[PDB]
Protein backbone atom coordinates (compact mmCIF):
# COMPACT_ATOMS: atom_id res chain seq x y z
CA UNK A 1 0.00 0.00 0.00
CA UNK A 2 1.34 3.42 -0.94
CA UNK A 3 -0.92 4.70 1.84
CA UNK A 4 1.14 2.63 4.27
CA UNK A 5 4.90 2.56 4.04
CA UNK A 6 7.46 4.91 5.59
CA UNK A 7 11.17 4.86 6.28
CA UNK A 8 13.18 3.89 9.34
CA UNK A 9 13.25 5.99 12.54
CA UNK A 10 16.12 8.43 12.27
CA UNK A 11 16.78 8.01 8.56
CA UNK A 12 15.14 11.33 7.67
CA UNK A 13 15.55 14.66 9.44
CA UNK A 14 13.81 17.90 8.81
CA UNK A 15 16.22 20.83 8.05
CA UNK A 16 15.94 23.40 10.82
CA UNK A 17 14.94 26.83 9.48
CA UNK A 18 16.75 29.73 11.16
CA UNK A 19 14.82 32.90 11.71
CA UNK A 20 11.30 31.85 12.75
CA UNK A 21 9.73 32.43 16.12
CA UNK A 22 11.30 32.43 19.54
CA UNK A 23 10.22 28.99 20.69
CA UNK A 24 12.15 27.12 18.02
CA UNK A 25 15.52 28.16 19.38
CA UNK A 26 16.98 29.69 16.23
CA UNK A 27 14.97 32.87 16.16
CA UNK A 28 16.15 36.42 15.43
CA UNK A 29 19.77 35.50 14.74
CA UNK A 30 20.10 31.97 13.40
CA UNK A 31 23.04 30.84 15.44
CA UNK A 32 25.42 33.57 14.34
CA UNK A 33 25.59 35.72 17.44
CA UNK A 34 26.08 39.46 17.31
CA UNK A 35 28.09 42.08 15.39
CA UNK A 36 31.25 41.19 13.53
CA UNK A 37 32.47 39.49 10.41
CA UNK A 38 30.99 36.03 10.94
CA UNK A 39 27.54 37.55 11.35
CA UNK A 40 26.99 39.18 7.98
CA UNK A 41 26.19 38.15 4.42
CA UNK A 42 29.33 36.49 3.15
CA UNK A 43 31.24 36.45 6.39
CA UNK A 44 33.82 34.10 4.96
CA UNK A 45 37.20 34.09 6.56
CA UNK A 46 39.72 33.06 3.92
CA UNK A 47 41.19 29.58 4.53
CA UNK A 48 44.56 29.62 6.22
CA UNK A 49 44.29 33.27 7.25
CA UNK A 50 45.31 33.78 10.85
CA UNK A 51 44.68 37.45 11.42
CA UNK A 52 48.00 38.93 10.43
CA UNK A 53 50.48 36.59 12.02
CA UNK A 54 52.59 34.85 9.41
CA UNK A 55 50.63 31.69 8.47
CA UNK A 56 51.98 28.12 8.60
CA UNK A 57 52.21 27.64 4.86
CA UNK A 58 54.48 30.71 4.53
CA UNK A 59 56.90 29.91 7.35
CA UNK A 60 58.11 26.49 6.51
CA UNK A 61 60.53 25.57 3.71
CA UNK A 62 59.67 24.04 0.38
CA UNK A 63 61.35 20.65 0.23
CA UNK A 64 59.69 18.55 -2.44
CA UNK A 65 60.68 16.99 -5.76
CA UNK A 66 58.38 14.96 -8.01
CA UNK A 67 60.42 12.65 -10.19
CA UNK A 68 58.50 11.53 -13.21
CA UNK A 69 58.79 7.81 -12.97
CA UNK A 70 56.15 6.91 -10.42
CA UNK A 71 53.61 7.77 -13.12
CA UNK A 72 54.38 4.36 -14.61
CA UNK A 73 54.68 2.28 -11.43
CA UNK A 74 52.17 -0.08 -9.89
CA UNK A 75 52.33 -3.19 -7.76
CA UNK A 76 50.27 -6.32 -7.24
CA UNK A 77 49.70 -8.18 -3.99
CA UNK A 78 50.48 -11.89 -4.02
CA UNK A 79 46.88 -12.70 -3.11
CA UNK A 80 45.56 -11.18 -6.32
CA UNK A 81 47.53 -13.51 -8.59
CA UNK A 82 44.63 -15.95 -8.31
CA UNK A 83 42.38 -13.36 -9.97
CA UNK A 84 43.66 -13.65 -13.52
CA UNK A 85 42.58 -16.60 -15.67
CA UNK A 86 44.75 -18.74 -17.94
CA UNK A 87 47.62 -19.03 -15.41
CA UNK A 88 50.08 -16.92 -17.43
CA UNK A 89 50.54 -13.63 -15.60
CA UNK A 90 51.80 -11.48 -18.48
CA UNK A 91 51.77 -7.72 -18.62
CA UNK A 92 48.54 -7.54 -20.62
CA UNK A 93 46.90 -10.33 -18.60
CA UNK A 94 46.79 -8.03 -15.60
CA UNK A 95 45.17 -5.28 -17.68
CA UNK A 96 42.17 -7.14 -19.12
CA UNK A 97 41.31 -8.54 -15.71
CA UNK A 98 41.47 -4.80 -14.71
CA UNK A 99 43.60 -5.66 -11.73
CA UNK A 100 46.17 -2.96 -12.27
CA UNK A 101 45.46 -0.02 -14.71
CA UNK A 102 46.07 1.02 -18.25
CA UNK A 103 49.37 2.75 -19.23
CA UNK A 104 51.40 0.97 -16.54
CA UNK A 105 54.65 -0.65 -17.63
CA UNK A 106 56.81 -1.77 -14.70
CA UNK A 107 55.06 -3.97 -12.12
CA UNK A 108 56.21 -5.70 -8.93
CA UNK A 109 54.69 -8.40 -6.74
CA UNK A 110 55.01 -8.19 -2.96
CA UNK A 111 53.98 -10.51 -0.13
CA UNK A 112 50.41 -10.05 1.06
CA UNK A 113 48.92 -13.54 1.53
CA UNK A 114 48.92 -16.97 -0.07
CA UNK A 115 48.61 -17.16 -3.84
CA UNK A 116 46.19 -20.12 -4.20
CA UNK A 117 47.12 -21.57 -7.60
CA UNK A 118 50.22 -22.22 -9.69
CA UNK A 119 50.84 -19.39 -12.17
CA UNK A 120 53.83 -18.44 -14.32
CA UNK A 121 54.95 -14.86 -13.80
CA UNK A 122 56.70 -13.27 -16.76
CA UNK A 123 57.52 -9.67 -17.52
CA UNK A 124 57.07 -8.67 -13.87
CA UNK A 125 59.60 -8.67 -11.04
CA UNK A 126 58.66 -9.77 -7.55
CA UNK A 127 60.36 -8.92 -4.27
CA UNK A 128 62.47 -11.36 -2.30
CA UNK A 129 59.74 -12.62 0.01
CA UNK A 130 57.25 -12.98 -2.83
CA UNK A 131 59.44 -15.21 -5.00
CA UNK A 132 60.01 -17.45 -2.00
CA UNK A 133 56.24 -18.04 -1.99
CA UNK A 134 55.59 -18.51 -5.71
CA UNK A 135 58.46 -20.95 -6.27
CA UNK A 136 57.20 -23.05 -3.36
CA UNK A 137 53.50 -22.92 -4.21
CA UNK A 138 53.81 -24.50 -7.64
CA UNK A 139 54.56 -21.36 -9.63
CA UNK A 140 57.45 -20.75 -11.99
CA UNK A 141 59.24 -17.41 -12.27
CA UNK A 142 60.52 -16.87 -15.80
CA UNK A 143 60.51 -13.87 -18.09
Amino acid sequence: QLNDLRSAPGARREKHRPGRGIGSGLGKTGGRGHKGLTSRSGGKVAPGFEGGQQPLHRRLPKFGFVSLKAMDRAEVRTSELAKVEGDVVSLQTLKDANLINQHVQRVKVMLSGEVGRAVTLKGIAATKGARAAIEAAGGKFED
Binding site: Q1, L2, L5, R6, S7, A8, A11
Partner: protein
Protein backbone atom coordinates in the same frame (compact mmCIF):
# COMPACT_ATOMS: atom_id res chain seq x y z
CA UNK B 1 4.43 -22.96 -4.30
CA UNK B 2 3.06 -20.97 -7.18
CA UNK B 3 -0.38 -22.25 -8.08
CA UNK B 4 -1.11 -22.01 -11.80
CA UNK B 5 -4.87 -21.85 -12.42
CA UNK B 6 -4.58 -24.55 -15.06
CA UNK B 7 -2.40 -27.04 -13.15
CA UNK B 8 0.81 -28.05 -11.45
CA UNK B 9 2.87 -26.00 -9.21
CA UNK B 10 5.77 -24.27 -11.05
CA UNK B 11 7.77 -24.25 -7.74
CA UNK B 12 10.19 -21.32 -8.25
CA UNK B 13 13.48 -20.51 -6.55
CA UNK B 14 13.07 -19.18 -3.02
CA UNK B 15 16.00 -16.78 -3.34
CA UNK B 16 13.78 -14.31 -5.17
CA UNK B 17 10.27 -15.14 -3.97
CA UNK B 18 9.82 -15.53 -0.25
CA UNK B 19 12.44 -13.08 0.93
CA UNK B 20 12.40 -10.85 3.98
CA UNK B 21 10.47 -7.60 3.60
CA UNK B 22 12.76 -4.62 4.17
CA UNK B 23 10.47 -1.65 3.78
CA UNK B 24 13.00 1.06 4.49
CA UNK B 25 14.49 -0.02 1.18
CA UNK B 26 11.16 -0.09 -0.65
CA UNK B 27 10.17 3.35 0.58
CA UNK B 28 13.42 4.77 -0.77
CA UNK B 29 12.93 3.08 -4.12
CA UNK B 30 9.39 4.29 -4.68
CA UNK B 31 10.38 7.82 -3.68
CA UNK B 32 13.22 7.95 -6.19
CA UNK B 33 11.12 6.53 -8.99
CA UNK B 34 8.21 8.84 -8.32
CA UNK B 35 10.37 11.93 -8.28
CA UNK B 36 12.10 10.63 -11.40
CA UNK B 37 12.39 13.54 -13.70
CA UNK B 38 9.12 15.20 -13.12
CA UNK B 39 8.76 17.84 -15.77
CA UNK B 40 10.19 20.41 -13.47
CA UNK B 41 9.99 23.82 -15.04
CA UNK B 42 9.57 26.49 -12.36
CA UNK B 43 10.82 29.88 -13.52
CA UNK B 44 10.71 32.88 -11.09
CA UNK B 45 12.92 35.88 -11.93
CA UNK B 46 15.24 37.87 -9.70
CA UNK B 47 16.29 41.44 -9.01
CA UNK B 48 18.38 41.51 -12.17
CA UNK B 49 15.85 40.46 -14.81
CA UNK B 50 12.88 42.70 -13.98
CA UNK B 51 12.12 45.50 -16.40
CA UNK B 52 13.96 48.69 -15.56
CA UNK B 53 14.89 49.89 -12.09
CA UNK B 54 18.36 51.36 -12.34
CA UNK B 55 18.59 54.76 -10.64
CA UNK B 56 18.30 55.93 -7.06
CA UNK B 57 14.87 57.55 -6.76
CA UNK B 58 15.46 60.11 -4.03
CA UNK B 59 19.05 60.88 -3.04
CA UNK B 60 20.73 59.33 -0.05
CA UNK B 61 20.37 61.83 2.78
CA UNK B 62 18.11 64.81 3.32
CA UNK B 63 14.68 63.75 2.09
CA UNK B 64 12.99 62.17 5.11
CA UNK B 65 12.10 58.85 3.49
CA UNK B 66 14.03 55.67 4.17
CA UNK B 67 17.14 54.79 2.20
CA UNK B 68 16.26 53.16 -1.11
CA UNK B 69 18.39 52.48 -4.16
CA UNK B 70 16.25 50.59 -6.68
CA UNK B 71 12.56 50.61 -7.57
CA UNK B 72 12.85 46.89 -8.29
CA UNK B 73 13.70 45.35 -4.94
CA UNK B 74 12.21 42.57 -2.78
CA UNK B 75 10.91 45.01 -0.15
CA UNK B 76 8.95 47.07 -2.69
CA UNK B 77 5.94 46.47 -4.98
CA UNK B 78 6.42 44.34 -8.13
CA UNK B 79 10.15 44.24 -7.76
CA UNK B 80 11.38 40.70 -7.68
CA UNK B 81 11.52 37.44 -5.80
CA UNK B 82 14.59 37.42 -3.63
CA UNK B 83 15.52 33.74 -4.13
CA UNK B 84 14.14 32.91 -7.53
CA UNK B 85 14.11 29.37 -8.83
CA UNK B 86 15.48 28.60 -12.27
CA UNK B 87 14.74 25.11 -13.67
CA UNK B 88 16.66 22.12 -12.39
CA UNK B 89 16.60 18.31 -12.35
CA UNK B 90 15.25 15.92 -9.73
CA UNK B 91 16.94 12.53 -9.84
CA UNK B 92 18.32 10.12 -7.23
CA UNK B 93 20.66 7.37 -8.35
CA UNK B 94 19.85 4.45 -6.10
CA UNK B 95 22.19 1.68 -7.40
CA UNK B 96 21.92 -1.26 -9.74
CA UNK B 97 22.01 -3.75 -6.88
CA UNK B 98 19.80 -1.64 -4.65
CA UNK B 99 17.06 -1.33 -7.24
CA UNK B 100 16.89 -5.11 -7.46
CA UNK B 101 16.67 -5.80 -3.75
CA UNK B 102 13.64 -3.54 -3.53
CA UNK B 103 12.08 -5.29 -6.50
CA UNK B 104 12.84 -8.66 -4.94
CA UNK B 105 11.32 -7.63 -1.59
CA UNK B 106 7.96 -6.41 -2.89
CA UNK B 107 7.75 -9.62 -4.86
CA UNK B 108 7.75 -11.67 -1.66
CA UNK B 109 4.95 -9.95 0.25
CA UNK B 110 3.02 -10.00 -3.00
CA UNK B 111 3.02 -13.79 -2.57
CA UNK B 112 2.32 -13.79 1.18
CA UNK B 113 -0.80 -11.63 0.70
CA UNK B 114 -2.26 -13.67 -2.21
CA UNK B 115 -2.32 -10.66 -4.52
CA UNK B 116 -0.58 -12.66 -7.24
CA UNK B 117 -2.39 -14.78 -9.83
CA UNK B 118 -0.20 -16.96 -12.04
CA UNK B 119 -1.83 -18.31 -15.20
CA UNK B 120 -0.77 -20.66 -17.96
CA UNK B 121 -1.09 -18.20 -20.84
CA UNK B 122 -3.02 -15.00 -21.45
CA UNK B 123 -3.79 -14.48 -25.13
CA UNK B 124 -6.51 -12.40 -26.74
CA UNK B 125 -7.40 -12.98 -30.37
CA UNK B 126 -8.92 -9.87 -31.96
CA UNK B 127 -8.13 -6.25 -31.07
CA UNK B 128 -11.51 -5.61 -29.49
CA UNK B 129 -12.10 -4.36 -25.98
CA UNK B 130 -15.26 -6.32 -25.20
CA UNK B 131 -13.45 -9.55 -25.92
CA UNK B 132 -10.91 -8.90 -23.18
CA UNK B 133 -13.56 -7.90 -20.63
CA UNK B 134 -15.09 -11.36 -20.94
CA UNK B 135 -11.74 -13.10 -20.54
CA UNK B 136 -11.02 -11.33 -17.25
CA UNK B 137 -14.44 -12.49 -16.07
CA UNK B 138 -13.16 -16.08 -16.11
CA UNK B 139 -10.45 -15.42 -13.51
CA UNK B 140 -12.81 -13.23 -11.49
CA UNK B 141 -10.64 -10.12 -11.63
CA UNK B 142 -11.10 -6.39 -12.22
CA UNK B 143 -8.49 -3.57 -11.88
CA UNK B 144 -5.58 -5.75 -13.00
CA UNK B 145 -1.92 -5.14 -13.73
CA UNK B 146 -1.03 -7.58 -16.51
CA UNK B 147 2.65 -8.56 -16.48
CA UNK B 148 3.83 -10.50 -19.50
CA UNK B 149 6.78 -10.53 -21.88
CA UNK B 150 4.92 -11.08 -25.16
CA UNK B 151 3.03 -7.78 -25.34
CA UNK B 152 1.24 -8.12 -28.66
CA UNK B 153 -0.68 -5.64 -30.78
CA UNK B 154 -3.83 -7.59 -30.13
CA UNK B 155 -3.30 -7.15 -26.41
CA UNK B 156 -1.95 -3.61 -26.50
CA UNK B 157 -4.71 -2.11 -28.64
CA UNK B 158 -7.15 -3.50 -26.15
CA UNK B 159 -6.98 -2.05 -22.61
CA UNK B 160 -5.95 1.39 -23.88
CA UNK B 161 -9.53 2.23 -23.06
CA UNK B 162 -10.34 -0.05 -20.13
CA UNK B 163 -10.85 1.87 -16.96
CA UNK B 164 -8.53 0.13 -14.55
CA UNK B 165 -6.67 -2.51 -16.56
CA UNK B 166 -3.05 -1.90 -17.50
CA UNK B 167 -0.69 -4.05 -19.56
CA UNK B 168 3.09 -3.85 -19.30
CA UNK B 169 6.27 -5.60 -20.28
CA UNK B 170 8.35 -7.45 -17.71
CA UNK B 171 11.07 -4.79 -17.99
CA UNK B 172 8.58 -1.96 -17.91
CA UNK B 173 7.31 -3.06 -14.51
CA UNK B 174 8.26 -0.36 -12.00
CA UNK B 175 8.11 -0.49 -8.18
CA UNK B 176 5.01 1.72 -8.06
CA UNK B 177 2.65 -0.35 -10.21
CA UNK B 178 3.47 -3.54 -8.35
CA UNK B 179 2.30 -1.89 -5.11
CA UNK B 180 -0.60 -0.10 -6.76
CA UNK B 181 -3.00 -2.12 -8.99
CA UNK B 182 -4.33 -4.34 -6.17
CA UNK B 183 -4.00 -7.68 -8.01
CA UNK B 184 -1.18 -8.61 -10.39
CA UNK B 185 -1.55 -11.21 -13.15
CA UNK B 186 1.67 -12.90 -14.26
CA UNK B 187 2.20 -15.77 -16.70
CA UNK B 188 4.53 -18.74 -16.50
CA UNK B 189 6.96 -17.05 -18.86
CA UNK B 190 7.28 -13.96 -16.68
CA UNK B 191 8.08 -15.97 -13.57
CA UNK B 192 11.04 -17.42 -15.43
CA UNK B 193 12.50 -14.07 -16.47
CA UNK B 194 12.59 -12.86 -12.87
CA UNK B 195 15.31 -15.44 -12.37
CA UNK B 196 17.29 -13.98 -15.28
CA UNK B 197 16.89 -10.46 -13.91
CA UNK B 198 16.79 -10.78 -10.14
CA UNK B 199 18.19 -14.27 -9.63
Amino acid sequence: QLNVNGAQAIEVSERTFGGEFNETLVHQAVVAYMAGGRQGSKAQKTRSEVSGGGKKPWRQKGTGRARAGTIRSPIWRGGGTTFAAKPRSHEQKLNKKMYRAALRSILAELVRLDRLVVVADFAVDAPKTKGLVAKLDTLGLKDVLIVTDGVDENLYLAARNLAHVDVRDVQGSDPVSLIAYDKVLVTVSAVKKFEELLG
